[PDB]
């Protein structure tokens, strides 16, 4: 009936002065815009159908045409930025916000979905959706005693749309909008559905990706222990944003980093630092690097949790991106650590894998490793054990690598390598 209609036929039906013909043609457009291979979104836009679909959103007297036009517009808004813009330019934002209060759950959900696509386009459309007042009716749909009474798909779509209102930077979402959403986000983070948990974690990872003031807003809501719990989840779509959020929090103050340690996050790192997913190992090692960039008592917690052998491990063998982050973790540790802590790092076998990485064709990793060597030598100078370290670097073929770096293209590498040879290998 409404299957495989041409755009011309859809236009003829929508341009008729018959509500039922308009409904049948709108359903036909929805089905066209719903096909798996190449939906004709641009053809529907060029035919001038977006203003007609937006006017159909306001037809309270005909709920099926509201649903069909909301679905058609959701499919257009899910496309390119230009396609989303066409939906916004048609006046769809206030029309979709008005549909959030609809007595029909399938229409309200379609309006939630459409607004998530519009807000997800970027900062400007996210902030425009907020200015049109979407946050209050969206939050009202979740103002229930128990989230378990809501339909699964309905809750998943609401969580996803709220996460897009938390997403993007330059600028980050408005402070008052973040404050308004956060109590509902904390509640969704304690829900039992894995898709709700994944998207709630993604929302938290976006909000913590910024200055310390942004991290503070989140950490003050007491979510860090729940994030550490999710960091231990078996589902990879939950662990990925939970680790991103924890990794973002430890870029903050020493006090914000301490809340992550206090919640017991370091006990999860033996498995994260050996995770079969390279991106988990990489971001776990980045997280570790920001913790070793902290206080000496925080470096001590890394030691006590037996995580230094795990850092020796990732430095020895891992994908290059993880090895670069491991090099950073070692340089941060050696910069802020005590002599005893630096001595412990050498005893765990850090020298040989640190030297083997000097062969890498990446100027940044060479600079970072050369800095770590200098810091380890500075500790050895305080104990008068520089000779023991010089022999150790010579034996694993590290001397041949530093000597070769004296003729390197980079200025900082050339200067640092010449300094180490003149001070400890002459």
């Amino acid at each position: 009936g409404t299957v495989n209609w041409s755009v011309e036929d859809i236009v003829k039906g929508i341009n008729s002065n018959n509500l039922e013909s308009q409904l049948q043609a709108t359903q036909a457009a929805r089905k066209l815009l719903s096909r798996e291979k190449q939906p004709p979104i641009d053809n529907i836009i060029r035919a001038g159908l977006i203003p007609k679909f937006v006017s159909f959103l306001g037809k309270t007297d005909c709920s099926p045409i509201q649903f069909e036009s909301a679905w058609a517009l959701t499919n257009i808004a899910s496309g390119t930025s230009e396609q989303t813009k066409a939906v916004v330019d048609g006046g769809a934002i206030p029309a979709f916000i008005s549909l959030l209060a609809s007595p029909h759950a399938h229409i309200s959900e379609q309006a939630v979905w459409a607004l998530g696509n519009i807000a997800g386009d970027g900062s400007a459309f996210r902030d425009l959706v907020i200015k049109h007042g979407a946050i209050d009716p969206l939050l009202a749909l979740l103002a229930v005693p128990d989230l378990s009474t809501l339909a699964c798909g309905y809750l998943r779509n609401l969580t996803w749309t709220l996460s897009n209102l938390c997403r993007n930077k330059n600028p980050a979402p408005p402070l008052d909008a973040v404050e308004q959403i956060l109590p509902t986000l904390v509640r969704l983070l304690h829900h039992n559905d894995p898709e709700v948990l994944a998207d709630s974690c993604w929302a938290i990872s976006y909000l913590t990706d910024g200055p310390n003031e942004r991290i503070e807003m989140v950490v003050k809501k007491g979510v860090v222990p729940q994030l550490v719990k999710l960091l231990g989840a078996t589902e990879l779509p939950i662990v990925t944003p939970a680790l991103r959020a924890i990794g973002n929090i430890v870029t903050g103050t020493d006090e914000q980093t301490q809340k992550v340690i206090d919640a017991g996050a370091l006990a999860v790192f033996p498995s994260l630092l050996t995770n079969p997913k390279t991106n988990i190992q990489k971001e776990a090692t980045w997280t570790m690097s920001n913790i070793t960039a902290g206080r000496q008592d925080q470096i001590q917690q890394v030691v006590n949790h037996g995580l230094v052998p795990f850092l020796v491990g990732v430095l020895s063998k891992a994908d290059f991106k993880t090895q670069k982050e491991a090099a950073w973790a070692i340089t941060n540790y050696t910069s802020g650590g005590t002599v005893e802590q630096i001595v412990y790092l050498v005893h765990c076998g850090i020298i040989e894998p640190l030297m083997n990485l000097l062969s890498a064709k990446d100027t940044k990793i060479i600079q970072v490793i050369l800095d770590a060597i200098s810091n380890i030598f500075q500790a050895a100078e305080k104990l008068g054990e520089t000779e023991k370290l010089s022999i150790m670097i010579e034996e694993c073929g590290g001397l041949d690598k530093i000597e070769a770096l004296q003729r390197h293209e980079n200025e900082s590498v050339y200067k640092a390598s010449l300094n180490l040879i003149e001070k400890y290998f002459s």
Partner: peptide
């Protein structure tokens, strides 16, 4: 992210 319906 953006998502299509069906």
């Amino acid at each position: 992210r953006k998502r299509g319906y069906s």
